[PDB]
A paper describes a structure:
Peptides derived from the HIV-1 gp41 CHR are potent HIV fusion inhibitors, which specifically interact with the viral gp41 NHR to form heterogeneous 6-HB to prevent fusogenic gp41 core formation.
For AP1 and AP2, an optimized linker “SGGRGG” was used to assemble the NHR and the artificial peptide into a single recombinant protein (N36-L6-AP1 or N36-L6-AP2). Interestingly, the crystals of three different inhibitors belong to three distinctive space groups: P21 for N36-L6-AP1, R32 for N36-L6-AP2, and P63 for N45/AP3. Also, the conserved hydrophobic residues, such as W43, W46 and I50, in the artificial peptides were deeply buried into the hydrophobic grooves formed between each pair of NHR helices, similar to the corresponding residues of W628, W631 and I635 in the native gp41 CHR. Thus, S57 in AP1/AP2/AP3 plays a role in stabilizing the interactions between the artificial peptide inhibitor and its NHR target, resulting in their stronger binding affinity. However, in N36-L6-AP1, N36-L6-AP2 and N45/AP3, I54 (corresponding to T639 in CHR) can strongly bind to L20 and L21 through fully hydrophobic side chain interactions. In N36-L6-AP1, R48 interacts with E45 and E52 to form a salt bridge network. Compared with AP1, triple-site mutations were introduced in AP2 and AP3, i.e. M44E, R48K and E49K.
Numbering used by the authors:
A (entry chain A): 0 to 72
B (entry chain B), C (entry chain C): 1 to 72
Write the structure that this text describes.
Amino acid sequence: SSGIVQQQNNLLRAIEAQQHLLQLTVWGIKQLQARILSGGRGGWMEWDREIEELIKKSEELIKKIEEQIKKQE
Amino acid sequence: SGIVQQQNNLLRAIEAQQHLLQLTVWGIKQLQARILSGGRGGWMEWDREIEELIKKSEELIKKIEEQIKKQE
Amino acid sequence: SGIVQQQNNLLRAIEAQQHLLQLTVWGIKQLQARILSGGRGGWMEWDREIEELIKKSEELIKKIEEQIKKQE
């Protein structure tokens, strides 16, 4: 059960697990930031922006890989 | 070069990023402890969601590592 | 798509997550600097470990992209 195909499927599951972890850490940072520094001064506004754009980019790629794997005919 | 060696390197990247993640979690927990005493405000659930995904992620990485070895 | 095209997409996913990790480390550092004065309490080693792991994984990521292109 250790072929390349299988390993690629497992790497994907690891990638998605870590993706979920990243969103959890982002949630935590926002909670702390909101309590310390209400308002986005010092670059937190561009930070929010970059995060949201990279989260979308990442979940899109994951979706696409999940589609490639299923696409097997 | 080749699919096998590229996969091993992908695993190394993911493993390095796993260690980075666990460091960032440590950082957040330290800060949260200082600003707010306790696990009120959602932090209890957060701690538990985090540790669940961490072990799951760790298991998959060890699993792939094993598959790579069994193939040799 | 095949294994080759999948690896390429996996790499892109990993590089996106590398940039995410860089952004979260930035946020944690901003917070720590505002709350705490020095590098006491483990933040000194945290900084060093973080920077090492960040360099190591982006080294691996850049290497893989190049290895793959060298396969043509």
